[PDB]
Paper text:
Using X-ray crystallography, we crystallized and solved the structure of AtBioZ at a 1.99 Å resolution. The dimeric nature of the AtBioZ protein belongs to the space group of P 21 21 21 and contains two protomers in per asymmetric unit (ASU), of which the refinement statistics are listed in Table 1. The lid domain of AtBioZ contains four α-helices and two β-sheets, which is covering on the ‘α/β/α/β/α’ core domain. The core domain of AtBioZ features a triple decked sandwich that is formed by nine β-sheets and ten α-helices. In brief, the β-sheets of β1 and β4–β7 are sandwiched between the helices α3–α5 and α6, together with helices of α13–α14 to form the first layer, while the sheets of β8–β11 are sandwiched between the helices of α9–α12 and α6, together with the helix of α13–α14 to form the other layer of the “sandwich”. Interestingly, a putative catalytic triad (C115, H255, and N285) is centered in the core domain of AtBioZ. Structural alignment revealed that the root-mean-square deviation (rmsd) of Cα atoms of AtBioZ is 2.8, 2.7 , and 1.2 Å, in comparison with FabB, FabF, and FabH, respectively, while the rmsd between FabB and FabF is 1.4 Å. The diameter of substrate entrance of both AtBioZ and FabH is measured to be around 5 Å. The depth of the substrate-loading tunnel in AtBioZ is 20 Å, quite longer than the counterpart (15 Å) of FabB. Unlike that the FabB substrate-binding pocket whose entrance is close to the dimeric interface, the entrance of the AtBioZ substrate-binding pocket is relatively far away from the dimeric interface. Similarly, the surface around the entrance of BioZ pocket is enriched with positively-charged amino acids, namely Arg39, Arg153, Arg221, and Arg260. In particular, we localize that three residues (S84, R147, and S287) at the distant bottom of the tunnel might neutralize the charge of free C-carboxyl group of the primer glutaryl-CoA.
In contrast, a fabH-like gene, bioZ, seems to be domesticated into a unique bioBFDAZ operon in certain α-proteobacterial species. Genetic and biochemical characterization demonstrates that BioZ catalyzes the condensation of glutaryl-CoA (or ACP) with malonyl-ACP to give 5’-keto-pimeloyl ACP. This intermediate proceeds via type II fatty acid synthesis (FAS II) pathway, to initiate the formation of pimeloyl-ACP, a precursor of biotin synthesis. Thus, we proposed a working model that the α-proteobacterial BioZ enzyme behaves as an atypical member of β-ketoacyl-ACP synthase III to synthesize C7-fatty acyl moiety, bypassing the canonical ‘BioC-BioH’ earlier steps of pimelate generation.
Numbering used by the authors:
A (entry chain A), B (entry chain B): 2 to 328
Amino acid sequence: QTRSSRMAGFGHAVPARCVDNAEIEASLGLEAGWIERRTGIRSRYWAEAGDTLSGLAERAGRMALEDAKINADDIALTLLATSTPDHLLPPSAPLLAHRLGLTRSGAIDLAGACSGFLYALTLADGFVRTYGRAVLVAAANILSRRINPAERASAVLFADAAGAVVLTPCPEVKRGVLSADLVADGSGYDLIQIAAGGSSQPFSAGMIAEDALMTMRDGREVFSRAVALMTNTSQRVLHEAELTAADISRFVPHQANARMSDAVCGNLGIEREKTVRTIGSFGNSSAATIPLSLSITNAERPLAGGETLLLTAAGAGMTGGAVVYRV
Amino acid sequence: QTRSSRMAGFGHAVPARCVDNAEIEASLGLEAGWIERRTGIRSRYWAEAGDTLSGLAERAGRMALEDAKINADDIALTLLATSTPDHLLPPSAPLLAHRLGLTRSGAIDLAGACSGFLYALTLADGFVRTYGRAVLVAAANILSRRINPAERASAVLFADAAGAVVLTPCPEVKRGVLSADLVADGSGYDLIQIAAGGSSQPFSAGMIAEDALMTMRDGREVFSRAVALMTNTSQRVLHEAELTAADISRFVPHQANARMSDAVCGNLGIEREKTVRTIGSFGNSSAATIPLSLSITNAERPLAGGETLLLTAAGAGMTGGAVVYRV
């Protein structure tokens, strides 16, 4: 009976601490204006002590359920894309579903770094279309607790946020997810990494916190690979949907830095004013970036029937993806 | 055009160190025969120094691709259910796809504790049916590196293994995944936990060693909750498929301990000889147990057309799931 999924509700959430560039530039000994000049970020939100990932995700997901006006019994599955779960075991998604009252919902976490939401969105859409039941698709990260002071990119980019979307079944064809392209390139596996705490080097007694913080070999190599991943996946879903960049109403790339968004937008020939930009006020929260941006743009101007979105992301791994969605 | 998915190829892999009960009983100071008496495990495999999660997953995945005789280009997606990735960042699945030559494959990790494979299988089936493209569904864990010798259940059950299934598109209806039920119950979130390393208590200098290892408040509460989760999800997918226990050819529960498998089997009215039992030789490797058991039972006696399998699992979180699959 079901032939597409509908993005029925949107939500986002950020912690209470707004962190201006000037605080961080002072910490790192950077000249005034450095961060906005190089990243396009002006401020970002950071967790305070006692804030949990699942609590942040809960506020974004509650906002999306409310937006969708959906009965809690209708949520069959909760997917949480996160790289920073409350605990390494269990996953945070069952706690998320429990706090939100989603008593008929399954729950699992997805770990796809910055690409996690587009994977979760593609997989949720397949579930909606196969079982004719609704899915809560959340993405949330507290990257502030992963910040490495020696890794300047992390200190200046990383932020904390959650976004969520309620996906409901729809009988109509030729709308919803028109195309999706999910790619991986593990030749870039070592470009962005946390050395310890996984199974290859469990965190042990004589280890420092910075062994458990992110490291990056060559930011420029990450930059060019990520632009290429997003460009190539975007080109493929456009061609698969038989559309051109001119048919896109809103372009929602992962918000890594402004120059990366500009590069992909330019490579695709998309008009710059079609790009949703939340990095100025919300920073880079990894997989939460796209659903937070979806919630922000829908609040500014509700998505209208017939509009076409292009979503695209790249991530450590390396991974990438793109989705064309028709309202 | 695609109406169902087919489990086209199976594979599994274990590390080289076979650890019999006697070694562990001496390590823990238990009387001889204690472990087999209480768990039904006789032996299990543990990683050696330098073994990686992705390398163990790679051997299971290559076996499954070989078994499926599939072109590498036909794999559109690699899903890796694991609680023990090589690193906290990035996910291990892109490395897995890379090492196996799956140059057209997306890749993401799923964190669903012991339920991780049934979630990944259900999500993969929806992907196969939506896009008409094949998926490698892997599950792998190195639990030995997470063992707390003081938590006796974990010391005597936990094992290291990988399993994998190649899911291919199939044009026929009334076969493949007939029904699936994914549930979560975050009221049991604190029952099985690792305290440190997540975002609620990140790894730091001078962290207690035990804080990075698995912990369990009430094994009996875990037991009865997990039995109920598996019983209730299995009853649901059976009724959704319009089947009874007598129609099941092979019953493949998560291999947690023999008494748990027997309790669920008995609850469902399933003939005990229909149960696939790998816990004796392979122990409890969390999400890997069901695909390892599929690989083992299909090797002993190839899955034949018309056979019906019932798969069920419960995990930390708590989560559960069940799948009815028609060959």
